[PDB]
Amino acid sequence: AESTLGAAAAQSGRYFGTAIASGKLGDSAYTTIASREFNMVTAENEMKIDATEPQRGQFNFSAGDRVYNWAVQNGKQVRGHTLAWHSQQPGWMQSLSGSTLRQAMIDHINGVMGHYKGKIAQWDVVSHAFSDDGSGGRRDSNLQRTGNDWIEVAFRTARAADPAAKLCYNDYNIENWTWAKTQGVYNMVRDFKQRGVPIDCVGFQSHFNSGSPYNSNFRTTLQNFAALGVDVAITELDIQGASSSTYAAVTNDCLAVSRCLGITVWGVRDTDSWRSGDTPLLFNGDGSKKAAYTAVLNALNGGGQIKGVGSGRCLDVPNASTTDGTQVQLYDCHSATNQQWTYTDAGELRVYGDKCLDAAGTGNGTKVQIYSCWGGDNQKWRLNSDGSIVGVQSGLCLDAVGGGTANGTLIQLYSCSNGSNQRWTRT
């Protein structure tokens, strides 16, 4: 109830989910991670309009049901995505307009929700309905040109089709409270609640990058929407660079809002991401947990010198050398730059400013040394709550050779054993 993301989130009545791609369900490495870590699933594309209604009036749930069945059979709830929006519309719908388009939208909603009636926890009824031009208004689309009330109609339609599902409005770039787009959505939801329009949740995609960075005020945004009487959900979270601090910050924002139902990251491994170039998820392509994974898990579980517990001595660079390939050791702790390590958001343990704790391989006995920082996974580490420090690439623990405790004891990689020569404390 604390070793996996879903289980850790469940401790506070929340979920931690991911986007599942039906085309990857035959990949054992993929499903092993997905079934183990998440208790909520969103079909990445299988429940969209084009996927569910390829031809007007012709519904197809082959792909959607495969994802839905995999989710339920493996113990995960499901978020339906998405009933009505401008993107990925089938060819036939893109050419529709006015009343006929409005009716098509309604028929689609009834068809899809009817198929999954009572089996979906949340439905993204409408998505991407606002512009990014900075006006805070609706974006120009075929759906919007049929009447400004199309969104309201979609929700009223959805409520009737399946009263058991929570109905959400989902969008991106509505995380920062100071943005006009965020205000546009806020005003609409407030209007809906005041007039009784059936809406139960607001989904924040949370696709963060240096173009639209995460800001601490995201929590305020979540709290402001929660105050309107709707639940909130982080629906498609991914962070460019996967900063451990940022991932932990977003996790704590949801935990700080009683109405935040949970968090879904948009994909399992970076190689499965729609934005793989931004290495924005919690697992590497080879399936290894990233530093960000541990940061998130620690947050969900309610969680300078590096001193070894068994030895009482500090991780030290011999004679304050800055030479690449110098194996680190244990040494009496004292004020010195060669014992001052900085844990970065990328998961590095830096010394001297630009040298990185580096594993010279991946197996037991591998030498741990300092080497120029370059971003390799053999230079990334996960700081566990039990005091162990695990190498991302190797999955092995920082280990004081042979359990030595005296000055000069070298540091190596070794299968984690919870031994005192593998436990560290930082001050």
Ligand SMILES: O=[N+]([O-])c1ccc(O[C@@H]2OC[C@@H](O[C@@H]3OC[C@@H](O)[C@H](O)[C@H]3O)[C@H](O)[C@H]2O)cc1
């Ligand atoms: O440019 N953006 O900021 C942006 C573009 C699209 C977008 O869509 C939302 O978030 C991602 C969507 O999923 C992807 O849709 C396209 C597929 O080819 C890809 O495989 C999916 O992962 C999601 O459905 C939608 O809600 C947001 C922001």
